[PDB]
């Protein structure tokens, strides 16, 4: 079996990669486990606006969201070559492991 974890800061790129993998699996005819959406990771940083100490304190909360999807497939020669031939856009990160 092969487990693939795909994470990105762009939901559209995430979905594009997921759809490409799904199409590859469908054309190869191999059963595929649907994309598991893992909980989004939200990095929040709260910072004081003023560069000095004078004035009423005000803060801004800058948030960076990272979205994660998981897929499980059964290993095959053509399927795995096609998957390794994925586009993997710049903002998406892909990890492949075998079980």
């Amino acid at each position: 079996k092969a487990r693939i974890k795909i994470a990105s800061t762009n939901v559209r790129s995430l979905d594009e990669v997921a759809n490409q993998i799904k199409q590859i699996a469908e054309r190869t005819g191999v059963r595929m486990s649907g994309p598991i959406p893992l909980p989004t990771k939200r990095i929040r940083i709260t910072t004081r606006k003023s560069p000095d100490g004078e004035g009423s304190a005000t803060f801004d909360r800058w948030e960076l969201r990272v979205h994660k999807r998981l897929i499980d497939i059964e290993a095959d020669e053509r399927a795995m070559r096609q998957i390794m031939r994925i586009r993997v856009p710049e903002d998406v990160t892909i990890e492949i492991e075998l079980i």
Binding site: I43, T47, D60, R61, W62, E63
Partner: peptide, 26 residues
């Protein structure tokens, strides 16, 4: 110095930088 995720960025620098580093104010 902000060490939340290894940024190693000053408070003022991070404030001036956040929009274009991928961070957003939702």
């Amino acid at each position: 110095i902000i060490r939340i995720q290894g940024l190693m960025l000053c408070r003022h620098c991070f404030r001036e930088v956040a929009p274009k580093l991928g961070f957003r104010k939702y």
